[PDB]
Write a protein that binds this ligand. Structure first.
Ligand SMILES: NS(=O)(=O)Oc1ccc2c(c1)S(=O)(=O)C(CC1CCCCCC1)=C2
Ligand SMILES: [Hg+2]
Ligand SMILES: [Zn+2]
Length: 256
């Protein structure tokens, strides 16, 4: 099935998922000089104080930190968003090296990783119904560069030992995602898609301008994860990012 290697990677996905060559695919390059300030955008509202994490799962592509979304605890609203979007999970995309790893690019610059905080539009009742809607999801994107350690990420880093291979999971309660946010909420926004198969075109993307820094040793541990299941030949979980896709006349809008 689908992966990130040469025989099953982003160049092959269109065969099972033809929407890969669609009109609103993600990620994209953010051309800072073509992106326009939008006065009609409301203030962005990230409310994660009441967030309830439950577990962390290696899914054979990345690892997901999962949240209890049966109630309006951790939510995203404002900006380009109409209504309320509940946090369901987060995950990262990263590279084999520090000069690659992010999905979105900024004037073609690739960051060492990208954090994705995934949210679903509560008017649609559940996540599965939301992914069938053009305004079903909102993903908050945050770039990672290598520098100083991100204290708020270490609890995540420490648990990766326990979920090395595909299918492994561990209890991961009482984790606060507020510790992963940069200082500024300046952002770009555009309509887009899921960046892995099934590549559904259901996402309002909100990409933060300000990166967070993480230490080399923090990123190194991400790279120790395995794509494979337990007892199989080792396939390091690295370069699990889709490259930039055609913008196709869509407009990227700035909050600043
Ligand atoms: N980078 S990203 O677009 O935020 O990545 C994803 C976030 C959430 C999900 C996926 C990618 S995914 O593997 O398509 C997924 C599970 C699927 C659930 C089963 C029905 C089809 C819709 C999605 C959730
Ligand atoms: Hg959709
Ligand atoms: Zn993602």
């Amino acid at each position: 099935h689908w992966g990130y290697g040469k025989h099953n990677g982003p160049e092959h996905w269109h065969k099972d998922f033809p929407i890969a060559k669609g009109e609103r695919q993600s990620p994209v390059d953010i051309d800072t000089h073509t992106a326009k300030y939008d006065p009609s955008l409301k203030p962005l509202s990230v409310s994660y104080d009441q967030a309830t994490s439950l577990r962390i799962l290696n899914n054979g592509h990345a690892f997901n930190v999962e949240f209890d979304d049966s109630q309006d605890k951790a939510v995203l609203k404002g900006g380009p968003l109409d209504g309320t979007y509940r946090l369901i999970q987060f995950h990262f995309h990263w590279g084999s090296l520090d000069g690659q790893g992010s999905e979105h690019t900024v004037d073609k610059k690739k960051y060492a990783a990208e954090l994705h905080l995934v949210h679903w539009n509560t008017k649609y009742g559940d996540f599965g119904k939301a992914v069938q809607q053009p305004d079903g999801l909102a993903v908050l994107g945050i770039f990672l560069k290598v520098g100083s350690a991100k204290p708020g990420l270490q609890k995540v880093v420490d648990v990766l030992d326990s979920i090395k291979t595909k299918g492994k999971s561990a209890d991961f309660t009482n984790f606060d995602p507020r510790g992963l946010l940069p200082e500024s909420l300046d952002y770009w926004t555009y309509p887009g898609s899921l960046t892995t198969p099934p590549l559904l075109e259901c996402v309002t993307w909100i990409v933060l301008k300000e990166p967070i820094s993480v230490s080399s040793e923090q990123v190194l541990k991400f790279r120790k994860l395995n794509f494979n299941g337990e007892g199989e030949p080792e396939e390091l979980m690295v370069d699990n990012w889709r490259p930039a896709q055609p913008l196709k006349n869509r407009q990227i809008k700035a909050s600043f």
